[PDB]
């Protein structure tokens, strides 16, 4: 059996949120919208919110306290702040960060007795306020998919099934400030969205086709984009929102589930520390999905790690033994291998994290 489901409604293109985004008046009268400390500050997107809200005459609190890798105790912040409010939905605005916090918050604020940790019980999560997204990176895809991941107490992050958001407002023009760095770490992250999905246990033909879509408008536009290219930038974030809509359908795969670490404990951004692990966990996929593995090779101009090599996405990263088989044995443990091809023990985790990191 396959299943199709992706509920909402993306409006992309310039000034998008003047042409389409009066559609929110739907949704109520009074809303929270979360973001980041600065960037929204810095690329208009704050600035047109605030415009839309005060056209639809909707009331607003901004909490611009969300930090990357959001934590438990950053979502606390805010719910304890609001819970005492009345809001009729919640706007993300930002990349992944906000975005996922946005939609973790709009189910407790809710759900008024919930925790943070029972988000993680799906049986818990059954009512929530409509969530907008409006992202800023090219990109995680948060704005079409129902995932939260957040940071809990012990530093491991950790992903929760919540809702679609209603509504997807993607304007290319306010990924133009990101940095290089960032440009490259998010498209890197768009790009292990498409792949992973192609390549999951739970791939369908309309993911597959969202994904093949995908990688090849990545490996065409992301050098570009990284570069400062408008026109690529724009085409990455069209990418990065095809890939969402593929794991939307699929979920991820022990990829993304090896680099989580490398994010919290070593401080490299999620995408690049996805990108860094995933031609390795490929080797081991060619043992169940060899073809499926060829053809995204191919599409990425012969080899996908080379394409991420020439990008520079590697760095030298410190490795203690102690931490080495700390990650092996909670990558072990991943839900994310039921949904991987091939067979994945301790070893060939450790040589994956050896490999990759250079260790
Ligand atoms: N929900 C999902 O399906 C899913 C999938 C993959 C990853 N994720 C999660 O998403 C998070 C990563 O999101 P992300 O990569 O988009 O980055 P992010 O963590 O939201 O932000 C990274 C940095 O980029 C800045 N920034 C954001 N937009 C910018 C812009 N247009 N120009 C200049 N700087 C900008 C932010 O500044 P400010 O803080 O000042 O705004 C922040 O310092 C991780 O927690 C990851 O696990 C979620
Ligand atoms: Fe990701």
Redesign the pocket.
Known sequence: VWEFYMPTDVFFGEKILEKRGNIIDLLGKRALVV?????????G?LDDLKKLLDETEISYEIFDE?????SFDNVMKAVERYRNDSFDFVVGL???????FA?AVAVLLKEKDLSVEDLYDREKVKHWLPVVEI???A????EV???????DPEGN?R?CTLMFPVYAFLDPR??????DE?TL??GV?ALS?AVEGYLSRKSTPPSDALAIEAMKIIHRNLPKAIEGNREARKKMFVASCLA?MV??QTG?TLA?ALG?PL?TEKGI???KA?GMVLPFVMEVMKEEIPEKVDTVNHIFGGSLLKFLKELGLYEKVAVSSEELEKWVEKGSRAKHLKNTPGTFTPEKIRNIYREALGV
Request: proline share 7%; glycine share 14%; net charge positive.
């Open positions: 973001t980041g400390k600065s960037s929204s500050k810095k690329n997107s969300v930090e990357e890798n959001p930002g990349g992944g960060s906000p975005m996922d939609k992202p800023t990176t990109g995680t895809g948060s998919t129902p995932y939260s991941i957040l940071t992050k992903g306010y990924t133009y400030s990101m940095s960032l770490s998010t992250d969205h969402g794991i939307a991820t993304h989580y994010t951004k999620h995408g996805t």
